[PDB]
Enzyme design. Structure first.
Site, PDB file in Angstrom:
ATOM      1  N   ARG A 125       0.868  -1.117   0.052  1.00 13.34           N
ATOM      2  CA  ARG A 125       0.150   0.087  -0.178  1.00 13.34           C
ATOM      3  C   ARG A 125       0.824   1.374   0.021  1.00 13.34           C
ATOM      4  O   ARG A 125       1.757   1.204   0.646  1.00 13.34           O
ATOM      5  CB  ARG A 125      -0.892   0.047   1.154  1.00 13.34           C
ATOM      6  CG  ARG A 125      -1.139  -1.429   1.798  1.00 13.34           C
ATOM      7  CD  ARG A 125      -1.411  -1.429   3.235  1.00 13.34           C
ATOM      8  NE  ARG A 125      -2.532  -0.257   3.339  1.00 13.34           N
ATOM      9  CZ  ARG A 125      -3.264  -0.112   4.496  1.00 13.34           C
ATOM     10  NH1 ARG A 125      -2.851  -0.865   5.519  1.00 13.34           N
ATOM     11  NH2 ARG A 125      -4.277   0.871   4.671  1.00 13.34           N
ATOM     12  N   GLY A 140      -7.192   7.940  -1.585  1.00 12.00           N
ATOM     13  CA  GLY A 140      -8.055   7.398  -2.700  1.00 12.00           C
ATOM     14  C   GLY A 140      -7.478   7.866  -4.019  1.00 12.00           C
ATOM     15  O   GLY A 140      -8.141   7.614  -5.015  1.00 12.00           O
ATOM     16  N   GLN A 191       2.820  -4.738   4.566  1.00  7.59           N
ATOM     17  CA  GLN A 191       2.076  -5.041   5.604  1.00  7.59           C
ATOM     18  C   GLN A 191       1.501  -6.648   5.642  1.00  7.59           C
ATOM     19  O   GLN A 191       1.006  -7.091   4.402  1.00  7.59           O
ATOM     20  CB  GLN A 191       1.053  -4.143   5.898  1.00  7.59           C
ATOM     21  CG  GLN A 191       0.457  -4.253   7.453  1.00  7.59           C
ATOM     22  CD  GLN A 191      -1.065  -3.627   7.432  1.00  7.59           C
ATOM     23  OE1 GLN A 191      -1.851  -4.011   6.601  1.00  7.59           O
ATOM     24  NE2 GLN A 191      -1.340  -2.850   8.479  1.00  7.59           N
ATOM     25  N   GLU A 305     -10.281   1.761   8.904  1.00  9.13           N
ATOM     26  CA  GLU A 305     -10.320   0.648   8.249  1.00  9.13           C
ATOM     27  C   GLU A 305     -10.044  -0.488   9.052  1.00  9.13           C
ATOM     28  O   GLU A 305      -8.774  -0.820   9.595  1.00  9.13           O
ATOM     29  CB  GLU A 305      -9.225   0.667   7.004  1.00  9.13           C
ATOM     30  CG  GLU A 305     -10.110   1.252   5.728  1.00  9.13           C
ATOM     31  CD  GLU A 305      -9.160   2.183   5.015  1.00  9.13           C
ATOM     32  OE1 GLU A 305      -8.763   1.855   3.956  1.00  9.13           O
ATOM     33  OE2 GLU A 305      -8.946   3.287   5.607  1.00  9.13           O
ATOM     34  N   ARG A 319      -7.021   7.416  10.567  1.00  9.12           N
ATOM     35  CA  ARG A 319      -6.922   8.589   9.855  1.00  9.12           C
ATOM     36  C   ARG A 319      -7.686   9.714  10.775  1.00  9.12           C
ATOM     37  O   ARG A 319      -8.414   9.227  11.681  1.00  9.12           O
ATOM     38  CB  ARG A 319      -7.141   8.560   8.344  1.00  9.12           C
ATOM     39  CG  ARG A 319      -7.488   9.510   7.510  1.00  9.12           C
ATOM     40  CD  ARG A 319      -8.556   9.091   6.436  1.00  9.12           C
ATOM     41  NE  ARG A 319      -7.997   8.419   5.687  1.00  9.12           N
ATOM     42  CZ  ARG A 319      -8.227   7.942   4.493  1.00  9.12           C
ATOM     43  NH1 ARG A 319      -9.751   7.664   4.340  1.00  9.12           N
ATOM     44  NH2 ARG A 319      -7.598   7.093   3.524  1.00  9.12           N
ATOM     45  N   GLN A 344     -27.476  35.074  11.797  1.00 16.43           N
ATOM     46  CA  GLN A 344     -28.396  36.106  12.099  1.00 16.43           C
ATOM     47  C   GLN A 344     -27.867  37.411  11.212  1.00 16.43           C
ATOM     48  O   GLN A 344     -28.665  37.953  10.536  1.00 16.43           O
ATOM     49  CB  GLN A 344     -28.153  36.304  13.723  1.00 16.43           C
ATOM     50  CG  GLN A 344     -28.824  35.335  14.420  1.00 16.43           C
ATOM     51  CD  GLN A 344     -29.164  35.826  15.916  1.00 16.43           C
ATOM     52  OE1 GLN A 344     -28.935  37.000  16.185  1.00 16.43           O
ATOM     53  NE2 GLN A 344     -29.844  34.917  16.587  1.00 16.43           N
ATOM     54  N   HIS A 805     -17.643   6.273  -1.953  1.00 12.30           N
ATOM     55  CA  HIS A 805     -17.279   7.495  -2.216  1.00 12.30           C
ATOM     56  C   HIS A 805     -18.646   8.127  -2.726  1.00 12.30           C
ATOM     57  O   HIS A 805     -18.746   9.341  -2.412  1.00 12.30           O
ATOM     58  CB  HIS A 805     -16.480   7.096  -3.748  1.00 12.30           C
ATOM     59  CG  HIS A 805     -16.482   8.353  -4.367  1.00 12.30           C
ATOM     60  ND1 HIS A 805     -17.236   9.655  -4.240  1.00 12.30           N
ATOM     61  CD2 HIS A 805     -15.570   8.565  -5.554  1.00 12.30           C
ATOM     62  CE1 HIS A 805     -16.951  10.346  -5.120  1.00 12.30           C
ATOM     63  NE2 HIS A 805     -15.909   9.830  -6.003  1.00 12.30           N
TER      64      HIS A 805
END
Ligand SMILES: Nc1ncnc2c1ncn2[C@@H]1O[C@H](COP(=O)(O)OP(=O)(O)NP(=O)(O)O)[C@@H](O)[C@H]1O
Ligand SMILES: [Mg+2]
EC number: 2.7.9.6
Length: 846
Positions: A125, A140, A191, A305, A319, A344, A805
């Site tokens: 990633r 993204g 990962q 996630e 995040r 106002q 999304h």
């Protein structure tokens, strides 16, 4: 040293447990978070490391053919699509054919055997960074790969990640946000794979309403990439406190599972499967508890996630949330209600600090700042009913919209628990005038720390000449006369808001005078098509001295000057002293002058006034004549006529003090800008307008002792920036809350509102033809179209999840939008039209 000078060097690889602080410049957003997320207690983050940006800088930003290209690209703008396509192709392939230095590929081998090793599947990633900009996001924007096994195949995908930084969609995104290529790097996160039964997104706020006290979940069967992928749908749970309080169960007809030998496949799901509750209520809570813990470690609402693999929850990202309107720090216990004075005052633009100081230092009421706007705490008024109704009734009349919002607060249930004489108006206005003339003469000799010491004096004089108890009585005398006249003439003749017709063309209205005079300015310009053509074009702040060149105008100029002497000190947004005035930049006035000419006939000051009178005077006698046709007839009509005379006598003064006030503001603003001008010369300040970000006192003791703190100032700007993007509620809540059947197709509400228009797009987005004034309907939506849809009024999609999304972006653009509809692409035939609303989840035929 004693560490072999081995020893002031940037590393190539860092373990989630090694990642230092604010090295975002090494491991980027997704990485710096993963890192910090590891160090949490009771949270399972998989293990891994980050390919540091050094590896990117060394492999790819230190290639001449590369830099040559990026330079060729810095040339293009969004208008140039093909060059982008082409250059992108080229740049992208150069990366997938630029091998990685054996040196680096050996650090990786070393760590990756710790996690380990090359027989285990990994997640590649991409976490990116923008230099000297740690609060930028690429959510993204770049690729990611699930289930990569093997060295040969790990290196292949690290290179495909770097490549994902040069896709048109990514490139074009930087052009629009002016991030600079060559200034953006990519770390790669390596990962451990989790083969989960269920994965999804979680928010520790509510996406709609920013509740802050309610958590929302989006869950599905299988791997996560599917949900973010755009098709499948998802399950939506909402948890408040420890109680599940909503369950939308969706039709998840797809899932994505790992292959034993790398990669990923997509399985249709057995029908019985597609309506299952993908978490069990014990897991929903067990999960919410987690999200709460994390949020506590970070100190702000987070976006998460997660994965479910044999009971166990794994956190695989975190995040913050960026879209929350903040909350004032009121040190007062319990559930409180703040009302926007932004709404106002009819402003609800952010206000800079110097301006905020001034609004604050002149009122004696206690207000709060949040989000760069102003709020009043009204919580105690709502306790005692004698005063609750006593309130809502007042707003109910002006700011009627504010009230509706208020009422919904009122029954959330869980939440809570004489008249000065006619000489007055005259005297009042005179002394305001005279006060302002001394002020004018008095400030031009003042300077230095005196000048500040000066306007502290004047802010009392101001309050004194502008807000006497005589002045207020005068203001209220007119307004109270409206109240009386509105209800009592409801109850006898059955006509509401008669006070509006009776108020027309009433004397001494300072603002109403102003608009008439700007009608005449407009009138001067109609004979001379020369000018109007000019003004229409010019983006010159001194268009003004270029006016006598054309005689078609040039009278135009003596006009503008007279008008700018009596009114140049106003602007839309006058209440922020920092805002640019009309006399400051006359170009900001043009568009009105222009819009008057388009939409009014000549001499309409003359007529619109007159027809104001004649109609307020024939509505005066129509009332009274009709009144004495009833019981106590003569006494009611007698009764109202004093009221009308009170009305027209005082109603126009209502408008005066704000004018009296911002008039002094402007005088301050200018002396306050000389000081700033001077400070620059002295070397203390970079720009003279760099004071708009200091409060009054902060500022005042910079001209006493010449010292300033610029990452105060810079955070201030950075933040004023973040709040301009935000749109204040009419009602803010102690808990951050934002306040204000027909043959029907059910869905997921997602985003609030109601609109109407056009048809479905299948849609070949790639070769997509859109159109103004239309609602959208695909079934899959993903970031690919984020930079494509401004023109839309509303959205509807087959795929579901309120943190898809479709949702999160429709929620920012302010469109109402429903997702999760059963077969919308089908079932809404032939691209016709429709009406949708999103506060509830429905969709229907017109
Ligand atoms: N180690 C992992 N094991 C299992 N699933 C994972 C792992 N890492 C990530 N995922 C999931 O697979 C997807 C990874 O995509 P990723 O790019 O990390 O998020 P994204 O939304 O697609 N892009 P971004 O906005 O930058 O986060 C997400 O759905 C993750 O939840
Ligand atoms: Mg993600």
């Amino acid at each position: 040293h004693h560490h072999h000078h081995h020893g002031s060097m940037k590393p190539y690889v860092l373990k989630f447990q090694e990642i230092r602080p604010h090295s975002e410049a090494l491991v980027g957003g997704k990485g710096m978070n993963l890192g910090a997320c590891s160090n949490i207690e009771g949270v399972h983050v998989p293990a891994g490391f980050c390919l540091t940006t050094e590896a990117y800088k060394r492999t790819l930003a230190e290639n001449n053919e590369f830099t040559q290209l990026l330079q060729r690209l810095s040339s293009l703008k969004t208008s140039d699509m093909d060059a982008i396509r082409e250059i992108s192709e080229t740049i992208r392939t150069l990366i997938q054919h630029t091998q990685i230095p054996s040196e680096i590929a050996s650090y990786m081998d070393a760590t990756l055997l710790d996690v380990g090793g090359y027989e285990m599947p990994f997640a590649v990633r991409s976490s990116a960074t923008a230099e000297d900009l740690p609060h930028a996001s690429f959510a993204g924007q770049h690729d990611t790969y699930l289930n990569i096994i093997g060295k040969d195949a790990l290196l292949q995908h690290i290179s495909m990640c770097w490549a994902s930084l040069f896709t048109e969609r990514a490139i074009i995104y930087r052009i629009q946000n002016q991030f600079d290529h060559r200034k953006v790097q990519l770390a790669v996160v390596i990962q451990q794979m989790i083969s989960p039964e269920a994965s999804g997104i979680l928010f520790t706020a509510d996406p709609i309403t920013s509740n802050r006290k309610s958590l929302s979940i989006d869950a599905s069967f299988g791997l996560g990439e599917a949900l973010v992928s755009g098709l499948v749908s998802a399950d939506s749970y909402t948890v408040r406190e420890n109680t599940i309080t909503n369950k939308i169960i969706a039709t998840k007809k797809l899932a994505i599972y790992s292959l034993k030998e790398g990669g990923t496949e997509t399985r249709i799901l057995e029908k019985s499967q597609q309506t299952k509750q993908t978490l069990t209520d014990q897991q929903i809570i067990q999960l919410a508890k987690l999200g709460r813990k994390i949020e506590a470690y970070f100190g702000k609402p987070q976006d998460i996630e997660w994965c479910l693999a044999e009971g166990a929850f794994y956190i695989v990202q975190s995040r913050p949330i960026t879209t929350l309107y903040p909350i004032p720090e009121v040190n007062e216990p319990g559930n409180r209600v703040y009302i926007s004075v932004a709404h106002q005052q009819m402003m609800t633009d952010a206000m800079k600090p110097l301006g905020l100081s001034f609004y604050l230092m002149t009122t004696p009421a206690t207000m709060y700042t949040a989000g760069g706007r102003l709020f009043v705490d009204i919580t105690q008024s709502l306790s005692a009913k004698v005063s609750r109704d006593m309130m809502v009734n007042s707003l109910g009349q002006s700011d009627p919209l504010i009230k509706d919002a208020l009422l919904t607060v009122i029954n959330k249930k869980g939440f809570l628990p004489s008249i000065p004489d006619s000489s007055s108006v005259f005297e009042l206005v005179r002394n305001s005038e005279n006060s302002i003339k001394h002020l004018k003469q008095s400030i031009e000799t003042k300077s230095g720390s005196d000048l500040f010491d000066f306007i502290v004096e004047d802010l009392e004089e101001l309050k004194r000449v502008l807000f006497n108890p005589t002045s207020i009585d005068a203001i209220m005398a007119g307004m109270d006369a409206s109240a009386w006249l509105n209800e009592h003439i409801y109850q006898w003749l059955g006509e509401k808001n008669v006070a509006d017709k009776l108020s027309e063309s009433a004397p001494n209205n300072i603002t109403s005078q102003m608009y008439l005079e700007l009608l005449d300015v407009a009138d001067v310009i109609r004979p001379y098509p020369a000018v109007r053509a000019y003004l229409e074009q010019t983006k010159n702040p001194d268009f003004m001295n270029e006016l006598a060149t054309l005689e078609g105008g040039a009278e135009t100029k003596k006009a503008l000057e007279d008008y700018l002497q009596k009114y140049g000190m106003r602007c839309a947004g006058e209440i922020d002293l920092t805002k640019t005035r009309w006399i400051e930049n006359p170009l900001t006035l043009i568009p009105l002058i222009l819009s008057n000419i388009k939409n009014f006939d000549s001499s309409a000051s003359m007529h619109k006034f007159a027809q104001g009178e004649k109609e307020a005077f024939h509505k005066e006698q129509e009332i009274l004549r009709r009144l004495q046709e009833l019981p106590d007839g003569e006494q009611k009509a007698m009764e109202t006529k004093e009221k009308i005379d009170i009305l027209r006598h005082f109603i126009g003064y209502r408008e005066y003090p704000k004018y009296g006030m911002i008039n002094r503001y402007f005088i301050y603003k200018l002396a306050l800008l000389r000081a700033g001008e001077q400070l620059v010369k002295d070397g203390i300040l970079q720009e003279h307008e760099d004071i708009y970000f200091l409060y009054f006192e902060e500022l005042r003791e910079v001209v006493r002792t010449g010292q300033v703190d610029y990452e105060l100032i810079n955070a201030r700007k950075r933040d004023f920036a973040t709040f301009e993007k935000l749109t204040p509620p009419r009602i803010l809540t102690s808990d951050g809350e934002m306040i204000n059947p027909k043959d029907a197709i059910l869905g997921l509400p997602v985003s609030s509102g109601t609109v109407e228009g056009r048809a479905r797009v299948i849609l070949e987005m790639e070769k997509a033809d859109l159109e103004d004034g239309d609602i959208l309907v695909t079934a899959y939506t993903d970031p690919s179209w984020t930079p494509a849809f401004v023109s839309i009024k509303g959205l509807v999609t087959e795929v579901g999840g309120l943190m898809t999304h479709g949702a999160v972006i429709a929620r920012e653009y302010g469109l109402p939008a429903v997702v999760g509809v059963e077969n919308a692409t089908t079932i809404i035939k032939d691209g016709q039209q429709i009406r949708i609303n999103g506060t509830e989840g429905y969709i229907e035929i017109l």
